[PDB]
Amino acid sequence: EKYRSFERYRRRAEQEARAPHWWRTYREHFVRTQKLLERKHFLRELRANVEEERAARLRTASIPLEAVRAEWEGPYHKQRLAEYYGLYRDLFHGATFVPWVPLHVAYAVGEEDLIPVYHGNEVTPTEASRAPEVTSLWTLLFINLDGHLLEPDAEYVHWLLTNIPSNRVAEGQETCPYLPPFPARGSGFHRFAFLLFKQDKPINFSEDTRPSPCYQLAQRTFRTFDFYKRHQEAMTPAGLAFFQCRWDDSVTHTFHQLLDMREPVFEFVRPPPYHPKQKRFPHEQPLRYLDRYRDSH
């Protein structure tokens, strides 16, 4: 058969390229049931509706999109964002968990509204002046995955709560007091992820308790993997929420006022200049040949 449109060849060609082959190619080098029956009944009703048919032919139909979002929510798609941004590799050394509790967080700004914290969202450090609102007996931890200034694997806590009764977070132990974001300048977008871990039994995390207030980076540094490994028996993550933050004026305030340190500033480091090595005695070297080699020409 011959493709009657370019797309037919393109779609097959695109699919063909994606699939691996024995010959070398670029990619290898560089790379419940009851509910459905109820759903089917709605389809018949929706299709039968004469008004809906008229709207379709009149191209005037509309949708309550807000309902779609709630019904769509979500576990499988929520995992994609966390994995896509590299939370799992940095936070659990590659362990991947499907979030089952629809965790949602927002940074409270003033009193009129609270800034959402989507998956992959961008929130300025200024807007994060105060701690955010997070919505059985579980725990909850805050992380600065790439906000660390000295060690790559290490990361800093904003605030860590343990033994959170049911859902109410006010009763959780404030092991780590809240700290505003402090992303270094020149490093682009820093990803901060919010993790919710199922707590099988209430356990005193004396090891993770930190002085309140604490303004030392030497004690804020920690590792999620080893911390989770120590509690991995009773800890199974289920909630995810992470945003990106750039440098901002508030960051200077955080680094100086309470962190009490000079603001970190970074940029791509260029290689040392390349210098040709001329010969001390240019034996049998004319000026015309040296003229091309030297700057003058």
Partner: protein
């Protein structure tokens, strides 16, 4: 002061840090192949016999944001999976999923007939009003 201690060079591990900054590498090869590969993300719109689907796909071929009328939430409020209005809704829904995913920029390369289709044009109108950009920023060298 202990806090002052900082490494000479930063350690940023965010995959999209370079992409968001614009310094991430875009495929500049494939000079003998069409179309250009100088896009971090692409909008893939698949119109099946009974369903219309739109996706946002990275160069690697893995969809990050997927919007399909096959999804239960959209269809229940959507009369017919194949329709001009459905293209608008999936674009707005795809945008909302893009809003959920944090992806603001994308590269759309419609085919000659696909571009001429009014439904796809309205779907593009759905994306622009939702703020999703059909054109990505240029790479930084």
């Amino acid at each position: 002061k202990e806090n002052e201690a900082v490494a000479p060079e930063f350690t940023n591990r965010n995959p999209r840090n370079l992409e968001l900054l614009g310094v991430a590498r875009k495929e500049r090869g494939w000079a003998t192949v069409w179309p250009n590969r100088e896009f971090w993300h692409r909008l893939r719109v698949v119109k099946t016999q009974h369903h219309v689907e739109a996706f946002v796909e990275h160069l690697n071929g893995q969809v990050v944001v997927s919007a399909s009328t096959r999804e239960w939430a959209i269809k229940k409020h959507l009369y017919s999976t194949r329709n001009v209005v459905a293209c608008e809704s999936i674009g707005r829904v795809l945008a909302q999923r893009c809003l959920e995913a944090g992806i603001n920029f994308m590269v759309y390369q419609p085919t000659p007939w696909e571009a001429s289709s009014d439904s796809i044009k309205r779907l593009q109108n759905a994306m622009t009003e939702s703020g999703v950009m059909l054109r990505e920023p240029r790479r930084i060298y």
